[PDB]
From a paper:
R. flavefaciens FD-1 is a gram-positive cellulosome-producing anaerobic bacterium that possesses the most elaborate cellulosome system thus far discovered in nature. The parent protein, RflaF_05439 (accession number: ZP_06142651), consists of a tandem repeat of two conserved modules at the N terminus and a C-terminal XDoc, which also binds to ScaE-Coh (unpublished results). In silico analysis of the structure implied that the protein belongs to an established superfamily of cysteine-like peptidases, termed NlpC/P60, and this domain will hereafter be coined NlpC/P60_2. The NlpC/P60 superfamily of peptidases is characterized by a conserved catalytic triad, which contains cysteine, histidine and a polar residue (i.e., glutamine, aspargine, histidine, glutamate or aspartate) within a catalytic core.
The X-ray crystal structure of the second module of the tandem repeat of RflaF_05439 from R. flavefaciens FD-1 was determined at a resolution of 1.38 Å. There are no significant differences between the two molecules in the asymmetric unit (RMSD of 0.06 Å for all Cα atoms). The overall fold consists of two globular domains that form a tight interface: an N-terminal α-helical domain and a C-terminal domain comprised of 6 antiparallel βstrands covered by short α-helices and loops. The potential active site of NlpC/P60_2 is located in the channel groove that runs along the interface between the N-and C-terminal domains. The crystal structure of the protein module described in this work allows the assignment of a putative function for the RflaF_05439 protein, which is identified to be a member of the NlpC/P60 superfamily, possessing the characteristic conserved catalytic triad residues (Cys109/His215/Gln230). A fourth residue, Tyr71, is also conserved. This residue is important for formation of a putative oxyanion hole, which helps stabilize transitional forms between the peptidase and the substrate. In the NlpC/P60_2 structure, extra electron density was discovered contiguous with the side chain of the catalytic cysteine, Cys109. This extraneous electron density was modeled as acetate. In any case, is it likely that the modified cysteine would lead to an inactivated enzyme, which may explain why attempts to demonstrate protease activity were unsuccessful.
Numbering used by the authors: 23 to 268
Write the structure that this text describes.
């Protein structure tokens, strides 16, 4: 069976709850309902995928188009009409927005409880993402800080046959040009890719901004539900479960 690393630690929902100082419940069912609703409406779908790591402005919240960030957004294909997203920026926004819907708090507050990049805060925009009290940030820092439960899979087939995945889990595709599994994710790389699982436990389905057609294809890109395709040609997988499974 699949061995869970950091087995005595915390699930993603629990970690977010802690980061929020118990202001956000991060309930699995509500997150799943949010995913169903916001994959179907016109808030995210259709937002251009753009090659700026800090892009986090979906069609429904085109916020970076109305601050100094607009210049960087425009260079890489962001638009005033539909905004623009990159992969981590999308997952950050989706989680933050879900927490805002659940709690009634403004997304500007809930985004502070969700990891993104350790350099997003230093960029100097109006919104901030999670950081440690010491000022570090990003996904592997979050995993280590909260001792997050995680799984590693060398193949997509192993992941999808493991019985571990639930809708709402976070999946990282780890660029096989820099490493395998979690160790690979700790290494700076061109093409690690993140998304939110939307399948039934065995189906190949996730919600992401990035490749929608094939592993390694960065021409055919968008913000949508699609199979789990990496930005890299070769991938292994890290799963950060949202909550304990049924």
């Amino acid at each position: 069976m699949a061995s869970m690393y950091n087995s005595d630690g915390w699930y993603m929902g629990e970690a977010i709850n802690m980061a929020s100082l118990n202001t956000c419940a991060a309930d699995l069912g509500k997150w799943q309902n949010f995913i169903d609703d916001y994959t179907s409406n016109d808030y995210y779908k259709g937002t251009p995928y753009i090659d700026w790591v800090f892009a986090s402005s979906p069609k429904g919240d085109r916020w970076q188009m109305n601050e100094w960030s607009v210049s960087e957004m425009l260079k890489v294909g962001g638009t005033y009409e539909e905004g623009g997203l990159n992969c981590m920026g999308f997952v950050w926004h989706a989680i933050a927005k879900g927490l805002s819907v659940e709690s009634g708090l403004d997304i500007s507050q809930t985004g502070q409880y969700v990891p993104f990049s350790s350099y997003f805060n230093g960029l100097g925009l109006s919104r901030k993402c999670w950081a440690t009290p010491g000022g570090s940030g990003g996904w592997t820092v979050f995993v280590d800080y909260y001792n997050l439960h995680y799984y590693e899979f060398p193949t997509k087939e192993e992941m999808l046959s493991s019985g571990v995945l639930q809708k709402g889990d976070i999946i990282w595709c780890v660029d096989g040009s820099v490493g395998l599994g979690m160790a690979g994710l700790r290494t700076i790389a061109d093409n690690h890719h993140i998304g939110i699982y939307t399948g039934n436990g065995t189906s190949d389905s996730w919600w992401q901004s990035g490749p929608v057609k094939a592993d390694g294809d960065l021409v055919n890109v968008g913000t949508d539900v699609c199979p789990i395709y990496g930005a890299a040609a070769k991938n292994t997988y890290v799963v950060l479960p949202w909550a304990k499974k049924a």
